[PDB]
């Protein structure tokens, strides 16, 4: 009867050398008391007379600590007696206080009938401990409940940044504010009078892609380019018909002619920021911001390139029953005031609808409910406990510093000041569960089989290689489809997305149960890809096309044009963000697009929660299919000259954290 232990430690904090915890080996018929002594894998040795069986639970005590000791263990591995198996106890948690934390065997179970079984008795008790450490919270009304945290201080710790994260996170911020300080120096006596101008602060914070923004952000075609593949994708869809507020002025029949020669052809696309339309603007250091609902029709020539056609800034409204037109053969500064104000509310609608709320708030919504109603023993649980890492912090940091009241959104973007709120209300209500799924998503937008979107393609790629991951975890531990129905604490999850996080979400698509492996399938596809991939795709673009602010405005201070011959340098100049506007754009956008040191990518978690070797074989295939696709993405980019690389999977992390 002799017992090997190996014990993990991913990250601790002693102020003495050695630390005492009291391990307990417990098995099917009895348990064994220990004496370790933590010295951070490490290995300690042991034998006892009493016979274990099958070792099932490891408890742990920190004995004798002091209030400011800490320790993440990892898993704790014991080796029986014999040539018995490897035995795992995944942990991946701060462990609190004198308490006893105890770890169930690493095997995944789904619960069951019976109430004696230990495992029963363990994961209800840690899921009456996990709701009540991890609560739901109205931020604003009409908008998906957050984690009950004012703060990060509020946060539960198991959840918290680690060390190097945070100081990672606090090193950038204050690189930024260092940034927008040697760029208020270098811009406080400079004047700001012509296009040219912006490459005074259009320095540091870029990269390559960025710097052939800053080349050709007036061509048009890359103006079309962003709605493909750009920072917001999201946007563009095919037009079935032509809109109702595109309302042509009388004289313009030939643009009328060649619209519905293109709908009935099937290349007319069109990009509605229709959300917008009367959302109160931000007023920002007394100086009032304005807000535009665009719609700008583009169409999808023969050689694989988007083209524009017409950008009405502004909808219809009683005051002005047809509004300005722009077209390409206009004044080429009126047209470029109407491709910035399009530019503009793409910055809007890709901020709030497609990056915070798309994929932060609903990664939120997906880590609470899955701490809340999955426990630990739960193999969905441990499917997505690497893809909802660090995305409480993160989602708590934006609600505290972002997009707070007083905060730096409200600061730089058109929309602060509560009208960002409002957008959000706007936009929840238009979250559906299609939206949110790439073949569903790109199949109503008319996306698919479109050549020139990477986006769509690389996203149909992602989807499919995710889709697999999680048919083969499901498969693995849902045999039938009435293991499904059968799951309780599956059902309370999928109600705690929907019900309870996503706020009734029934009426927009989302399931209130599963009823079938397919359906499950496709749920957790759907939220490794929100968690993943989709926020891989709508963050990444910052960096390379929001550094040049005249390329996406994070607001407009001058109303928009309704004279064609009336604007000027001056207007244009005017219209476009000042210096501290634009340069917090930049900066907000560097800090919300770069690299992390710390960047865990996807499929890619050294964290062992599963320990059957049949998980971490369908891991290794979603490894390996994730590798070729980025062989294939790689292939693929070295012959563009504007290259997709956002949907890289050694680019795309493992979670939403930034
Ligand atoms: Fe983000």
Request: glycine letters at 6%.
């Amino acid at each position: 009867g002799r017992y090997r232990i190996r014990v993990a430690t991913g990250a601790w904090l002693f102020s003495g050398s050695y630390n005492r915890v009291q391990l307990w080996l417990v098995g099917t018929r009895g348990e064994a008391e220990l004496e370790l002594q933590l010295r951070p894998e490490e290995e300690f040795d042991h034998d006892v007379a009493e016979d274990l069986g099958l070792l099932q639970f490891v408890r742990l005590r920190k004995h004798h600590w002091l209030v400011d000791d800490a320790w993440f263990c990892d898993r704790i591995t014991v080796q029986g007696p014999g040539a018995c198996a490897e035995v795992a106890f995944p942990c991946y948690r701060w462990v609190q206080g004198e308490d006893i934390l105890s770890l169930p065997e690493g095997t995944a179970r789904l619960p069951g009938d019976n109430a004696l079984d230990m495992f029963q008795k363990h994961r209800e008790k840690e899921l009456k401990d996990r709701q009540q450490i991890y609560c739901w919270a109205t931020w604003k009304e009409g908008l998906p409940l957050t984690i009950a945290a004012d703060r990060k201080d509020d946060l539960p710790p198991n959840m918290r940044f680690h060390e190097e994260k945070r100081l990672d996170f606090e090193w950038t911020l204050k690189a930024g504010a260092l940034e927008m300080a040697l760029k208020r120096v270098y811009t406080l006596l400079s004047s700001w009078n012509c296009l040219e101008d912006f490459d005074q602060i259009f320095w540091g914070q870029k990269s390559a892609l960025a710097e052939k923004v800053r080349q050709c952000w007036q061509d048009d075609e890359l103006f079309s380019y962003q709605f493909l593949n750009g920072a917001n994708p999201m946007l563009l869809r095919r037009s079935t018909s032509l809109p109702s507020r595109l309302v042509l002025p009388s004289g313009m029949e030939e643009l009328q002619a060649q619209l519905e020669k293109e709908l009935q052809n099937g290349s007319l696309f069109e990009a509605d920021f229709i959300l917008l339309d009367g959302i109160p603007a931000n007023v920002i250091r007394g100086e009032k911001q304005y807000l535009a609902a665009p719609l700008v029709m583009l169409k999808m020539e023969p050689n694989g390139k988007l083209q524009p056609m017409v950008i009405q800034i502004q909808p219809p409204s009683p005051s002005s029953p047809t509004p300005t037109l722009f077209l390409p053969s206009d004044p080429p500064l009126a047209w470029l005031l109407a491709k910035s104000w399009v530019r503009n509310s793409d910055f809007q609608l890709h901020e709030i609808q497609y990056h915070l709320l798309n994929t932060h708030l609903v990664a939120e919504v997906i880590a609470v409910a899955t701490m809340r109603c999955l426990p630990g023993l739960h193999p969905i649980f441990k499917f997505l406990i690497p893809h909802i890492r660090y995305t409480m912090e993160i989602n708590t940091r934006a609600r505290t510093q972002l997009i707070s009241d007083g905060g730096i959104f409200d600061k730089a973007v058109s929309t602060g000041g509560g009208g960002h709120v409002q957008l959000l209300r706007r936009a929840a209500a238009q979250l559906t569960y299609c939206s949110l799924c790439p073949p569903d998503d790109l199949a109503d937008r008319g996306l698919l089989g479109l050549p020139g979107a990477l986006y769509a393609h690389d996203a149909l790629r992602l989807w499919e290689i995710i889709a697999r991951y999680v048919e083969g975890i499901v498969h693995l531990f849902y045999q039938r489809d009435d293991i499904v129905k059968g799951d309780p604490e599956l059902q309370a999850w999928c109600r705690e997305i929907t019900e309870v996080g996503l706020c009734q979400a029934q009426d927009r698509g989302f399931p209130v149960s599963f009823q079938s492996q397919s359906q499950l399938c496709h749920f957790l596809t759907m939220c490794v890809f929100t968690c993943t991939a989709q926020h891989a795709a709508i963050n990444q673009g910052q960096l390379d096309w929001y550094a040049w602010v005249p390329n996406a405005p994070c607001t407009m201070r001058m109303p928009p044009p309704t004279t064609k011959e009336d604007v000027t340098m001056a207007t244009v100049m005017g219209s476009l963000p000042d210096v501290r506007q634009a340069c917090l754009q930049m900066a907000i956008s560097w800090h919300l697009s770069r690299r992390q040191p710390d960047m865990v990518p996807l499929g890619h978690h050294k964290e062992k929660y599963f320990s059957g070797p049949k998980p971490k074989a369908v891991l290794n295939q979603f490894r390996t299919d994730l590798e070729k696709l980025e062989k294939e993405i790689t292939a693929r980019n070295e012959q563009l000259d504007w290259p997709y690389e956002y949907l890289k999977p050694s680019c795309i992390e493992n979670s939403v954290t930034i």
